[PDB]
Design a binder for this molecule. Structure first.
Ligand SMILES: CC(C)(COP(=O)(O)OP(=O)(O)OC[C@H]1O[C@@H](n2cnc3c(N)ncnc32)[C@H](O)[C@@H]1OP(=O)(O)O)[C@@H](O)C(=O)NCCC(=O)NCCS
Ligand SMILES: CC(C)(COP(=O)(O)OP(=O)(O)OC[C@H]1O[C@@H](n2cnc3c(N)ncnc32)[C@H](O)[C@H]1OP(=O)(O)O)[C@@H](O)C(=O)NCCC(=O)NCCS
Lengths: 134, 153
């Protein structure tokens, strides 16, 4: 049971996000989309996505569908829920015209890295990001 | 009016006349791209409102440059949007450690702010220790390290 998020789901979505305002912008925006997995009417997993038009490390085409975040409640892990949410994200990206899908994860997130490889992604590059307020 | 500025080292916003020298330098930052691709990049940068490059001129000769963009996409480690991102920066070996990059970045920062950016960001490879010391010495804070993934769709 996978669905594109709407206002009803906003509440369940926040609880999971808290574990991994915006729901507002996402609902309103065209380049934004979030998906949710339900067990007995309860959101037990989600994935946030966006269509990126700026440079994306490791990608040579534009726009790109970017998996901004993904989370599945510990107890529902290893049942294919993420594989399903990512396939929904891919479908959405592909018909918004993206020829490639991208994602990122921390060097310490070993399970995440294995999940990305198991789902067909290829590591492109590792980078350190910086920031300075103007 | 007591101290003329940029009498010998001057930071300029790139225009069509700098295309060839910028490209000459960019091939040294990013080897592997035909003069074509650099050129196409240069025309895109010139015509797009969220894109700009800066050229460091020593007595009229380009010795460094910085490519920047006003990013509206989410930018790792930032709380606001848009962000002025340093897409790349390069200074000829013979002119390093003289404050050039400092000025290119200050000019990028300044263009970013006038375009509504509250934050400036950059990224760099974990093998580039010199670039990591450069970012820290210039006031940037490391926000996060990540691994990027790609899948054709
Ligand atoms: C990453 C995460 C979303 C995976 O969710 P999931 O529902 O458990 O994943 P799936 O069951 O759909 O697994 C997809 C594939 O990855 C593999 N995988 C999942 N968990 C794994 C683990 N712990 N170790 C090794 N491989 C694993 C599965 O074996 C599966 O393999 P297959 O396709 O070859 O059959 C989940 O661990 C989680 O929510 N973690 C916390 C948040 C986080 O790390 N997010 C990542 C980036 S924001
Ligand atoms: C990174 C680079 C642009 C810096 O250019 P630069 O003109 O030499 O830098 P600056 O002189 O303005 O240096 C500013 C700051 O970095 C420090 N710095 C510069 N080179 C350094 C080095 N090799 N080791 C340690 N610190 C260094 C300066 O000392 C410091 O300022 P401070 O003295 O006021 O504290 C240049 O080395 C270069 O082109 N590197 C190769 C390409 C590259 O790696 N680009 C970055 C990623 S796209």
């Amino acid at each position: 049971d996978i669905r594109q998020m709407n206002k009803t789901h906003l509440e369940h979505w926040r609880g999971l996000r808290k574990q991994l305002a915006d729901g507002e912008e996402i609902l309103q925006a065209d380049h934004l989309a979030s998906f949710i997995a339900m067990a007995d009417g309860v959101a037990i997993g989600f994935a946030d996505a966006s269509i990126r038009h700026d440079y994306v490390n490791g990608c040579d085409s534009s726009p790109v569908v970017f998996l901004e975040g993904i989370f599945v409640l510990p107890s529902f892990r290893q049942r294919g829920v993420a594989k399903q949410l990512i396939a929904a994200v891919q479908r959405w990206g592909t018909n918004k015209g993206c020829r490639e899908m991208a994602s990122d994860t921390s060097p310490e997130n070993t399970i995440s890295q294995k999940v990305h490889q198991a789902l067909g992604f290829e590591e492109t590059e590792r980078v350190i990001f910086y920031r300075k307020r103007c």
